[model samples]
Target: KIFKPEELRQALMPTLEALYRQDPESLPFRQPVDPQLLGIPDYFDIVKNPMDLSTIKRKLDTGQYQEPWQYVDDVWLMFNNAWLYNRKTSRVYKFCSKLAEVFEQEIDPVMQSLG
Candidate 1:
């Protein structure tokens, strides 16, 4: 089974909303990171590319994701960017890891259904 671009976006909306409402732990990932405001001066130095859930949703809403895999990649990148910039011992790092698990769990069935 294959989804049209709109179908793909529609399919992904529930997952995105679930992730957004996940918990307070999920709040940071809901919007773009503020390197300066957060006082992480070297953030951009390590994380060359940054992503967030809202941004991904924006792209999806605008039909920027042409394929399901492209949407998947952005979700992965959103977590990967946090892991790259935040220290291993930091709460933010753990949040990203935990959210990655939640995301994988939620998205796998959708992908399988699409296939």
Candidate 2:
């Protein structure tokens, strides 16, 4: 299931949008993190590589992804950043964890097909 560039674009855009639609709790991750607004001024220091759904969309639209795994990594990184910055019991962390679970379930079949 190695997608040609156009196929990747076709496969990803809808999936990305679906991820947001599938989970209402995904709101926090819909855009870039507002460190100052969130009161975590040092967030950039802790999470060296910050990621969000919006950035992923931009990257995908711009043809920044050459491989499926790279796109998956960014999806994972978005959740990983949340886990790093927010405590396990915090609301934001809970939202992120829930969406991560949904994403895992959603993406498994796609990756398995490729395998």
Candidate 3:
């Protein structure tokens, strides 16, 4: 839900451009076993989740969620990709805050009593 179009564009430009400015075709891998890399359009990105979302969804379904606002924290935790974890960690925290705020204030759920 938080993948805004503008955000996607700047995501690469700011980081990618800075890293490559000094050299035409080089950028640090920024990992322990590091090697320079290429950016591919159609690529497989391995994203690691800090918390499994499926489990959280089940909590929402079963009313085990202690606070409705908690889903915002829960949802944003899924963006913990190792690649961007260090460079863009604060963005995730901001997103999580706004997510819970907007969702808690603006969202209205319509529940069906018939089962």
Candidate 4:
């Protein structure tokens, strides 16, 4: 059943904590990349800390959070990057796919304020 914002936070908080503690290998992180390849000097980061419910709720309302469906957006983005880098990190693909599933499934409960 669809939920209000407060309810969404309540339900997702534990799940996000679990995801945060998952295999470090599956999480996103970054280091310096080739200048030609990256075109910008920046480092990508992984979501290392457990998600904070209050923060998540606030971000959700402000639309600062990437939101759940963007999990698929992440899937494609990361998949292509791995492909471009010529790496064989299947775990990340599997990881992101699973996250996408959860996001698409449970995150629908988030409220209209996010729109």
The TM-score leader among the candidates is: 1
Off by over 4 Å in 4: 29-91, 94-115
User: Highest lDDT among the candidates is held by which one?
Assistant: 1
Error of 1 at 94 (Å): 1.1
Per-residue lDDT of 43-82 in model 2, one digit per residue for the tens? 9898999899999998888888878888999999999999
lDDT (Cα, 0-100) at 85 in candidate 4: 39
Instruction: For residues 16-89, write the lDDT of model 4, one tens digit per residue.
Output: 45444545533542222343474533323322122222344444455443444433243335434544433356
After superposition on all C-alphas, the RMSD of every candidate to the true structure, in Å, is 1.5, 1.9, 15.3, 8.7
lDDT of 1: 0.86
Query: Against the correct fold, how does model 2 do in TM-score?
Result: 0.88
Residue lDDT tens for model 3, 13-67: 2322332242221212222222124333222343334443344444455555443
lDDT of 3 at 97: 42
Q: Tell me the lDDT of candidate 4.
A: 0.43
Instruction: Compare candidates 2 and 3 on TM-score and give the better one.
Output: 2
Clashes of each: 0, 0, 0, 0
User: By summed lDDT, which 10 consecutive residues of candidate 3 come out lowest?
Assistant: 106-115
lDDT measured at residue 54 in model 4 versus the true structure, 0 to 100: 36
User: What lDDT score goes with residue 106 in model 1?
Assistant: 92
lDDT of each: 0.86, 0.83, 0.35, 0.43
Clashes of 4: 0
Once fitted onto the true fold, the runs of candidate 3 whose alpha carbons sit more than 4 angstroms away are 1-49, 81-115
